[PDB]
């Protein structure tokens, strides 16, 4: 029934080409400049609207369009064609819609622009889809598209300019809200648009778009403008069908037939159940100090000196991740309120919780979420106490809005999972989520409903049980990661809590317990053997495959041949391309139990998980002592591993750290609690089986 996905794989298409067939458009060497403006919204935004909130995050991102420049090291590639590919691939990684590069002339440097800048990276972001007339949340969104899309342009320009600054080259970001150059002119010269009746028109971006620019003296290979008159070739048969793995020409129209609140993926086709597919015993779940998060344990010294020394650095070794850091850290003060608010009367009719749910979903999809779900924020989902002052955390809000951001299939295909780009994949998703949820929570507060977002930089809730209760994933063998039937385990979640009354979603059942029970690929491929090859256990009141969080923490924080790790997400059979056959393999896994073992086995026989060298678009750069250079100890380039054989389930002994082996509630980062590994190993051997738990509970039912 869903026929918008691609027929053809993009496995041989380098990332710098992007998802659109820009290389098949008619181009010429030069065009005559003419006056032009960016697309704008058709209607005006009310005070019920989100406008003030996206404007605030744009202003925040504006502070990072310029910054300090690092010292130039010895490891930046000289070739401007290679530089151009890398930087275009970077923009597409950050979800630019269309990217091009041009030279800056003297008339461009005659304004406030740095006279050393000779090149411009120009990118467009397409307008978001908006709800139709009469749909829930239409008043929240109408008239906000240029400001919403400007926000995303500032964000991307700030990250990319900061990335070039960390490589040792001055660079400045620009967008409508703060520009030293003529954006519309540069968009024409870089080949993204043409002028129609004084307004820019971009092939393929039929909803409208906004522009961002990074100017720099980092020399880049330039592009050519579009042929100025006549048909560009956007509906040629190779383009329409997406032969090279590009977006099919009918996808826009087909997508617009789904209500915005339903998302892009057909989650309405997955079975719902009232209780999760795995046992949750709420009366037996103890709340955990934030100080027990194993990154906080590492920071405090619980895992030894090396882990402590590397804690702040480990995800910020690559210059691209360093470009994101300022945005991530400075969104934290904007996360929101814990105190009750009074309804303000803004936001339209909020009396139907079913419609409030649809409005919130539409809002998340508009802003860029891949999935949106809603659950009750149960008290046991909040941490017991904060790690800084040690004060109790209250269960202050009623609902959790959970959103998933796809970490990116095509980048992960090129990667080892634990190489130089790994943490940049995590941070992009963390950054994008934090932005979306910050805006959404601010809108709730505008309507007089208390709301706070919960980011990688500062959460007061554990995301996992909210992902489970919101019906966005099932418990997987990976352990501390939940798996979605369409994007697999390839996601970062963001949560914001709120008091806005909403209908809640239900847990999902797509057969994963049976599937993971017959598969061991993640376990086999984990560089530190942290994933369980055995059966599910009870842990702090719930059934789970408990990974060894001490082993995984130490590997991610301290391994030196990349930046952190997410290899388990890469190796999973459910991590697949968004094509007709890929979707079909997932459908079969869901609908046909007798096919699962074959799918599991063929995933290895066909070498899924092999590194695709065409997709390796990033530079292997490690910042040490403030300077980018070649990796000091090398780079992980892992391939598929052989079996551990047949008895590994019975032989592997992992350590678990339920509340009794954690720093108690009220413990702060000022105290040290050496991790009790021998006790955690014994605790795992003593864990109740889920069968025994069900038997025990039944005797009190
Ligand atoms: C610290 C941390 C880690 C640490 C330490 C985890 C720990 N247990 O201390 C380590 C290094 C192990 C880790 C690893 C990774 N993590 Co991590 N991490 C966190 C973080 C920031 C805090 C977790 C926490 O507080 N743990 C301390 C206590 C609560 O741990 P716990 O008692 O052992 O409980 C864990 C689970 O059992 C589960 N949980 C708790 N209560 C309940 C109840 C039920 C019913 C269920 C089903 C589960 C569940 O949540 C906890 C996750 O650590 C969260 C984000 C967040 N705020 O939740 C993510 C988070 C869990 N990580 C995530 C991911 C993706 C990863 C990696 C894949 C790394 C990467 N490249 O992205 C790996 C996966 C490791 C694995 N095998 O599963 C995602 C998972 C998303 C998803 N799809 O489910 C999260 C939610 C971050 C995010 N916003 O997306 N991470
Ligand atoms: S790799 Fe196999 S076992 Fe591990 S999570 Fe994916 S499907 Fe489950
Ligand atoms: S469990 Fe940790 S170390 Fe193992 S693959 Fe996953 S992220 Fe890497
Ligand atoms: Cl994590
Ligand atoms: Na795969």
SS (H, E, C) 55-75: HHHHHHHHCCCCCCCCCCCCC
Distance in angstroms (rounded) separating the CA atoms of residues 526 and 386: 31
Structure tokens at 3: 């026929």
Is the shortest distance between the CB of 423 and ligand 1 below 6 Å? no
Helix (H, G, I), strand (E, B) or coil at 317: coil
- CA 523 to ligand 2: nearest atom: 4
Q: How far is the CA of 566 from the centre of ligand 4 (A)?
A: 9
Q: Say which residues have a Cβ less than 8 Å from residue 108's Cβ, sequence separation at least 6.
A: 120, 181, 182, 185, 186, 215
**Whether 553 contacts 295, CB under 8 Å:** yes
Distance CA 419, CA 574 (A): 21
Q: Which two tokens stand for residue 86?
A: 């890398």
**DSSP characters for 190-257?**
TTS-EEETTEEE-TT-TT-EEEEEEEESS------PBPSSS--STTSHHHHHTTTSPPPTTHHHHHTT
Instruction: Residue 64: name the closest of 345, 423, 326 by CA.
Output: 326
Ligand 2: residues within 6 Å at CB?
Answer: 476-478, 483, 515-516, 519-522, 572-574
**DSSP structure class, residue 632:** S
**Candidates 376, 453, 464: which one to mutate for ligand 1, based on the most atoms within 8 Å of Cβ?**
464
Q: Ion ligand 5 — residues with CB under 5 Å? A: 575, 608
Give me ligand 3 centre to Cα 552, in Å. Answer: 5
Tell me phi and psi for residue 645, to 5 degrees: 85, -165
Helices marked H in 519-595:
521-525, 549-558, 567-571, 580-591
Cα-atom radius of gyration of the chain, to the nearest Å? Answer: 25
Q: How many CA atoms lie within 13 A of 452 on its CB side?
A: 20
Ligand 1 atom with the shortest distance to the CA of 539? 37
Sheet holding 399-406, edge to edge: 371-376, 399-406, 491-498, 451-454
CB 515 within 8 A of CB 586: no
Candidate of 486, 515, 536, 575 to mutate for ligand 2, largest count of ligand atoms within 8 Å of Cβ = 515
Residues with beta carbon inside 6 Å of ligand 3? 418, 526-528, 530-531, 547, 552, 555-556, 565-568
- Measured by CA distance, the residue closest to atom 2 of ligand 2 is 519
Structure determined via: X-ray
Partners of 498 in the β-ladder: 399, 451
Minimal CA–CA distance to 503: which of 360, 335, 648, 679?
Answer: 360
- The pair of three-digit structure tokens given for residue 115, joined into one six-digit string: 């006279």
- Pocket probe for ligand 3: among 407, 520, 568, the residue whose CB has the most ligand atoms within 8 Å is 568
Ligand 1 proximity of 507 Cβ (cutoff 6 Å): no
Span from the CA of 463 to the centroid of ligand 1 (angstroms): 8
Indicate which residue's Cα is closest to atom 2 of ligand 3: 552
Write the CB contacts of 559 (distance below 8 Å, at least 6 apart in sequence): 418, 527, 565, 636
* Resolution of the PDB structure in angstroms: 1.7
- What are the structure tokens assigned to 186, written together? 């540069």
Cα separation, 382 vs 28, whole angstroms: 58
Rounded CA-CA distance 471/374 in Å is 8
Sign of CA dihedral 576, 579, 585, 591: positive
Helices (H) and strands (E) in the chain, counts: 24, 18
Does any ligand 1 atom lie closer than 6 A to the CB of residue 294? yes
CA angle (571 as vertex; 315, 589 as ends), nearest 5: 135
Task: Name the strand (E) or helix (H) holding 423.
Answer: helix 422-446
β-bridge pairing 399-406 and 371-376: antiparallel
Phi-psi region of 347 (alpha: psi -120 to 50; beta: other; left: phi over 0): left
Three-class HEC string of 111-135: CCCCCCCCEEEEEEEECCCCCCCCC
Nearest ligand (C-alpha, residue 559) = 3
C-alpha 666/C-alpha 385 separation (Å) is: 6
Ligand 3 atom with least separation from CA of 569: 6
Q: 662 CA distance to ligand 3 centroid (A)? A: 21
Tell me which long-range contacts 294-301 makes (C-beta under 8 A, separation of at least 24): 294/549, 294/550, 294/553, 294/657, 295/553, 295/557, 296/387, 296/669, 297/553, 297/663, 297/673, 297/675, 298/553, 298/557, 299/669, 300/663, 300/669, 300/670, 300/671, 300/672, 300/673, 301/672
Question: Do residues 441 and 496 lie in contact, with contact meaning Cβ atoms separated by under 8 Å?
Answer: yes
**Does 8 appear as a known binding residue?**
no
Cα angle vertex 612, ends 608, 616, to 5°? 140
What are φ and ψ of residue 306, in 5° steps? -65, -45
**Cβ neighbours for 263, distance < 8 A, ≥ 6 positions apart:** 361, 365, 369, 370, 371, 372
């Amino acid at each position: 029934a869903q026929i918008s996905m691609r027929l053809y794989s993009n496995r041989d298409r380098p990332n710098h080409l992007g998802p659109l067939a820009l290389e098949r458009l008619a181009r010429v060497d030069d065009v005559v400049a003419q006056p032009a403006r960016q697309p704008e919204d058709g209607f005006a935004a009310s005070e019920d609207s989100l406008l003030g909130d996206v404007e605030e995050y744009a202003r925040l991102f504006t502070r990072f369009l310029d910054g300090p420049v690092a010292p130039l090291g010895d490891a930046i590639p000289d070739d401007p064609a290679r530089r151009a590919e890398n930087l275009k691939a970077s923009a597409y990684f950050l979800d630019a819609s269309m990217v091009g590069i041009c030279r800056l002339d003297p008339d461009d440097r005659a304004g406030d622009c740095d006279p050393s800048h000779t090149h411009a990276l120009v990118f467009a972001v397409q307008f978001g889809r908006e709800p139709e007339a009469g749909e829930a949340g239409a008043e929240w969104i109408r008239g906000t598209n240029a400001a919403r899309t400007d926000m995303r342009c500032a964000e991307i320009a700030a990250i990319l300019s900061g990335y070039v600054r960390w490589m040792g080259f001055p660079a400045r970001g620009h967008f409508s809200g703060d520009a030293q150059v003529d954006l519309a002119r540069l968009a024409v010269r870089a080949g993204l648009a043409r002028v129609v009746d004084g307004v820019l028109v971009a092939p393929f971006l039929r909803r409208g778009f906004r522009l961002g620019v990074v100017t720099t003296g980092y020399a880049l290979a330039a592009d050519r403008p579009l042929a100025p008159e006549g048909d560009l070739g956007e509906t040629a048969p190779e383009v329409m069908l997406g032969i090279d793995g590009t977006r099919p020409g009918w996808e826009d129209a087909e997508e617009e037939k789904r209500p915005l609140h339903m998302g892009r993926y057909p989650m309405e086709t997955i079975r719902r159940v009232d209780e999760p597919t795995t046992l949750v015993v709420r009366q037996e779940i103890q709340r955990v100090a934030k100080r027990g998060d194993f990154f906080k344990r590492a920071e405090a010294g619980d895992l030894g000196e090396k882990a402590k020394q590397e804690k702040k650095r480990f995800p910020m070794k690559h210059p691209l991740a360093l470009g994101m850091q300022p945005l991530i850290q400075n969104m934290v003060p904007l996360q929101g309120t814990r105190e009750k608010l009074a309804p303000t009367g803004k936001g339209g009719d909020l009396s139907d919780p079913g419609r409030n749910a649809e409005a919130i979903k539409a809002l998340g999809y508009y802003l860029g979420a891949d999935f949106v779900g809603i659950c009750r924020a149960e008290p046991w989902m909040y941490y017991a106490s904060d790690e800084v002052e040690g004060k109790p955390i209250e269960a202050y809000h009623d609902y959790a809005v959970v959103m998933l951001i796809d970490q990116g299939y095509e980048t992960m295909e090129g990667a080892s999972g634990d190489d130089w780009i790994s943490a940049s994949q995590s941070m992009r998703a963390y950054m994008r989520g934090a932005e979306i949820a910050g805006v959404m929570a601010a809108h709730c507060r505008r309507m007089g409903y208390s709301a706070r977002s919960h980011s990688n930089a500062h959460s007061e809730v554990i995301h996992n049980p909210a992902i489970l209760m919101a019906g966005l994933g099932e418990v997987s063998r990976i352990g501390d990661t939940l798996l979605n039937p369409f994007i697999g385990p390839r996601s970062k979640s963001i949560v914001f809590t709120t008091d806005l009354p909403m209908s809640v979603d239900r847990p999902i059942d797509f057969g994963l317990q049976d599937f993971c029970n017959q598969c061991r690929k993640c376990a086999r491929e984990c560089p530190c053997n942290a994933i369980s090859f055995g059966d599910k256990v009870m842990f702090n009141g719930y059934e789970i495959w408990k990974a060894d969080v001490e082993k995984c923490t130490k590997y991610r924080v301290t391994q030196m041949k990349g930046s952190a790790c997410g290899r388990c997400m890469k190796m999973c059979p459910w991590n697949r391309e968004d094509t007709v056959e890929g979707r079909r393999l997932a459908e079969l896994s869901i609908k046909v139990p007798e096919a699962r073992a074959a799918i599991i086995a063929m995933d290895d026989a066909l070498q899924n998980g092999k590194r695709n060298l065409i997709k390796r678009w990033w530079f292997d750069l490690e910042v040490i002592d403030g300077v980018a250079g070649a990796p000091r100890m090398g780079t992980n380039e892992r391939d598929l591993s052989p079996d551990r054989g047949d008895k590994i389930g019975a032989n592997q002994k992992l350590a678990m750290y339920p509340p009794r082996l954690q720093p108690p509630p009220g413990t702060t980062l000022d105290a040290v609690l050496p991790v009790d590994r021998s006790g955690g190993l014994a605790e795992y051997a003593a864990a109740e089986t889920p069968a025994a738990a069900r038997a025990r509970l039944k005797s009190s039912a």
